[PDB]
Ligand binder design. Structure first.
Ligand SMILES: [Zn+2]
Ligand SMILES: [Zn+2]
Ligand SMILES: [Zn+2]
Ligand SMILES: [Zn+2]
Lengths: 72, 73
DNA sequence: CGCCTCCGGGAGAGCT
DNA sequence: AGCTCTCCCGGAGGCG
């Protein structure tokens, strides 16, 4: 019942991966159109409920790493 | 207490443009997509309510259409 | 028919 | 503005 991107409470399988609603819509938005997203740390930011908003680059990386994809 | 505009049963929200109950939503989608041709056994003016709605899909469909229901809404 | 679960996705409200 | 994230409602696939 835990999101594989941020460990918040998961709402189901979204875009192929067990995720929360937050990460589901974050990903849909990130994966379409152009976004810079630059990490301010060392591309290993902590992405949990409290901090996931801080680094969209690291959050997006984790989405991809977990296997999220539009085709699913 | 929100009432389906087609059959007066308890509405479940705004479906296809119109405040309807779940059964009317489901019925409407099926009616439009099976291109169903229904025939009224009366005078094209049946009472459509929770029990009677089953009797006359012709009149139920007509009412759905007259209320503004549309799949693209 | 009337209902169910599951998931995509728009609206919009509220941040920053 | 851009972004976040929950309220609704859509289809698909299924069941009694
Ligand atoms: Zn998450
Ligand atoms: Zn980062
Ligand atoms: Zn109804
Ligand atoms: Zn009739």
């Amino acid at each position: 019942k835990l999101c594989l991107v941020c460990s918040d409470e998961a709402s189901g399988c979204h875009y192929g991966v067990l995720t929360c609603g937050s990460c589901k819509v974050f990903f849909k938005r990130a994966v379409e159109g152009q976004h810079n997203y630059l990490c301010a740390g060392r591309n290993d930011c902590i992405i949990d409920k409290i901090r996931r908003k801080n680094c969209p680059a690291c959050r997006y990386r984790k989405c991809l790493q977990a296997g999220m994809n539009l085709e699913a």
